[PDB]
């Protein structure tokens, strides 16, 4: 009976069908559902990191949990089937992977730090890209030179130092690239 009383949920980059399912089920669970990102939002369900709502939460609101689209349907399913819930309300099991929708490429980084970066990208839900293509989201560069670097500038792909990755992992959110320039 109203397990999500006091929760205020908002979506970013969630398709209409899934957004309608989430708002309907979250409302039945007792939550408030907000189309705008209001000051009282507690949980942001995100389908991408490259949005103004996501950027605001990553920069200014670490208290707000960034959740996977599957959170509300999975919690609703347990609740409507009469299963016991706990005070965690499955939140920690459905946090959005930090590097969700990231496609990360590397350039000018030696071993073993190059393969360690690749492992961390995969561990945190990103896609690792050995080759640079126009759909890469971040190029982590050891130096500002070379073929991948020049093509990332041409394709307007973010070029960041590895500190972007480390700070994004510890912040549990993709951070903006202008703070991690070479």
């Amino acid at each position: 009976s109203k397990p999500l009383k006091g929760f205020v949920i908002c979506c970013t980059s969630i398709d209409l069908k899934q957004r309608t399912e989430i708002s309907t089920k979250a409302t039945k669970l007792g939550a408030a559902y907000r189309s705008d990102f209001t000051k009282d939002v507690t949980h942001l369900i995100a389908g991408d990191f490259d949005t103004p709502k996501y950027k605001f939460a990553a920069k200014s609101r670490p208290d707000i949990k960034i959740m996977s689209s599957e959170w509300i349907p999975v919690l609703y399913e347990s609740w409507v089937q009469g299963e016991d819930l706990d005070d965690g309300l499955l939140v920690d099991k459905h946090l959005l992977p930090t590097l969700f929708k990231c496609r990360v490429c590397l350039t000018n980084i030696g071993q073993p730090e190059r393969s360690r970066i690749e492992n961390y990208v995969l561990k945190h839900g990103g896609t690792f890209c050995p080759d640079l293509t126009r759909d890469v989201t971040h190029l982590i560069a050891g130096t500002s030179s070379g073929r991948k670097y020049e093509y990332a500038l041409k394709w307007k792909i973010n070029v960041v130092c590895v500190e972007w990755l480390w700070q994004s992992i510890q912040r549990n959110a993709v951070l903006e690239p202008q703070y991690f320039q070479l």
Partner: peptide, 10 residues
Amino acid sequence: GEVLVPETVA
């Protein structure tokens, strides 16, 4: 509540 970021325009 106070709007921090508006809804994405469809």
